[PDB]
Amino acid sequence: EVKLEESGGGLVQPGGSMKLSCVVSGLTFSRFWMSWVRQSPEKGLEWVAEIRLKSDNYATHYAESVKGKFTISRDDSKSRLYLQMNSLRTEDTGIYYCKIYFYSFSYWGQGTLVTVSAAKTTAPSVYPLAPVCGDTTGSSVTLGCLVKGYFPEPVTLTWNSGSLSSGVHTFPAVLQSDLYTLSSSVTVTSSTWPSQSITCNVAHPASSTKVDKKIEPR
């Protein structure tokens, strides 16, 4: 069972460098050609680089847009693919996938986020959203969490440590003025809350922020 796993993404400033790694298991790495492909919401899927085999003398090909700035390499002995990026520009921002392919197959890793920006890492503010009149008067009520003013992107949000899974809507973050805002809702039975606690668990790894915000009634 083939597994591809990208690592080493993150926040880097324009003009900066960064190296991606891609570890593959489940097949004989040295036998196959590999590529890096990136995705953006604004541009979709773009191939940037390919590397072939030892017998090929490790021939590589690149998209003209990264020629001379990107270098793809592989280590057949560790089953690892790499991408050395320098001279990064904001338009290089995206999710980077490594993939392995052949006549009969194609597999992509889970992808790693690369954010190229001059903006500073910033810890979010976490605010609890309790209703007024309260929904616990109709059988079901909806609560929320507002995670405001962070950077860069990835935060994690759970409810009751992931125990509340259903009835949850976590909205995609939106960037404005180099700061992100996100929100999430939980809908539960009115007999549930506020009698039983409901808590928003928010993490912003980049700032090592970890917040357990209890939604209290009133």
Partner: protein
């Protein structure tokens, strides 16, 4: 640059129906006899692309017979029979014949279902925020269909939108609805300057708007 053009951009279909998806290329993708490298992937929300079809018509692992690929020359088609629940997502074609490798812009599959009014919930600024000198009012509009919705904010009756941030979800896999959040962010002093706060939704399910409100 091989150009891969797909249509439609968006394909609403009902459960049990047939979906047909088109990918056209600016040139022959025949690598060798028997080898035309056109792939079909499915990318589900927050997920990696997964191979469905390779070499135009070959089904990959676990891929049901409901899925069939075909074409040649420069016209390729993906058809899926008896469209199911988990079929939602973005379908992409790709060519592996010519370097640089290229992809279509994707086709999003949408499961049709009955119309659904949004469930509207409005929330006042928290004390934590107000203490920092800020006041965001939030409104959720959840589990509605179809996706097209409009949202207005009215303060003390007068319409007013400035410091508004909207975000929405992808189609739900289990119930085929859409949800939306709207955040109106004021400074505490401006929030304090008025009394009635209303989130107003215009959706096809209702002739009038559907609104929720509070007074501070």
């Amino acid at each position: 640059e091989l150009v891969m053009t797909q249509t439609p951009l968006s394909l609403p279909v009902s459960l049990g129906d047939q979906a047909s998806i088109s990918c056209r290329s600016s040139q022959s993708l025949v690598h060798s006899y028997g080898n035309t490298f056109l792939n079909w992937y499915l990318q589900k929300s927050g997920q990696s692309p997964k191979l469905l079809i390779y070499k135009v018509s070959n089904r990959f692992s676990g891929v049901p017979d409901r899925f069939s690929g075909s074409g040649s020359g420069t016209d390729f088609t993906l058809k899926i029979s008896r469209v199911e629940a988990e079929d939602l997502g973005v379908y992409f074609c790709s060519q592996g014949t010519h370097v640089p490798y290229t992809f279509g812009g994707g086709t999003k599959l949408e499961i049709k279902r009955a119309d659904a009014a949004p469930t509207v919930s409005i929330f006042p600024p928290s004390s934590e925020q107000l203490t920092s000198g800020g006041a965001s009012v939030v409104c959720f509009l959840n589990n509605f269909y179809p996706k097209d919705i409009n949202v207005k904010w009215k303060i003390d009756g007068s319409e007013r939108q400035n410091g508004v941030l909207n975000s929405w979800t992808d189609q739900d896999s289990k119930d085929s609805t859409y949800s939306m959040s709207s955040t109106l962010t004021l400074t505490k002093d401006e929030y304090e300057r008025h009394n009635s706060y209303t989130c107003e939704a215009t959706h096809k399910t209702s002739t009038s708007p559907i609104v929720k409100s509070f007074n501070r």
